[PDB]
Amino acid sequence: KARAKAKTRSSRAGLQFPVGRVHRLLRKGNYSERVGAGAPVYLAAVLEYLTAEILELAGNAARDNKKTRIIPRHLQLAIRNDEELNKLLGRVTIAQGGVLPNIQAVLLPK
């Protein structure tokens, strides 16, 4: 059957993250019997904002380390240096990520 013009729900909201996949994962994730229409749009916008907040500092760490490619060390450097992303991911371990360069001031030589 001939339809109207096809347009994804992530394009109506101006998003890069999929609205339909987040709606599918909400409906098949056993959270409620019903999921409203603004819930996946809101959640995908929050997820795209958080992923952009991560990558915008990970690219800065990669550019500071003279690198044109993001490795897990750059993600750990972006997360543990931000003051408020460290509260969101305080109980999270990153593989091949290492720790921050952090020597206590009493251990430094005299």
């Binding site: 897990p72 060390r73 371990t93 593989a95 091949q96 990520g97 290492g98 720790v99 921050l100 360069p101 952090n102 020597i103 206590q104 009493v106 251990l107 430094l108 030589p109």
Partner: protein
């Protein structure tokens, strides 16, 4: 006359190097046999994926590094620079694990 450093200098250099680098610090072949020994208490003849022992190694290394950070805080609080068994036990008491 040969050349020797002072105690703590090469230690601080390795602190900066292993804080800078992201490689695993324990060899994989002892860790596979240790995980295989530990899992025999719960089930015998258990095969392991390589990725499973790798994930166990990353998580165990991260847990030990974070525990040594808390241990170093608890040892600096006691006006010392070395770490002692009571520092590890105090960190595990305040963390609420034992």
């Amino acid at each position: 006359k040969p050349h020797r450093y002072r105690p703590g200098t090469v230690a601080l250099r390795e602190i900066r190097r292993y804080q800078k680098s992201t490689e695993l610090l324990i060899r994989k072949l002892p860790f596979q046999r240790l995980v295989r020994e530990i899992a025999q208490d719960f089930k015998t003849d258990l095969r392991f994926q390589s990725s499973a022992v790798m994930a166990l190694q990353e998580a165990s290394e991260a847990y030990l590094v974070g525990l040594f950070e808390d241990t170093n805080l608890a040892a600096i609080h006691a006006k010392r620079v070395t770490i002692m068994p009571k520092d590890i036990q105090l960190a595990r008491r305040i963390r609420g694990e034992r």
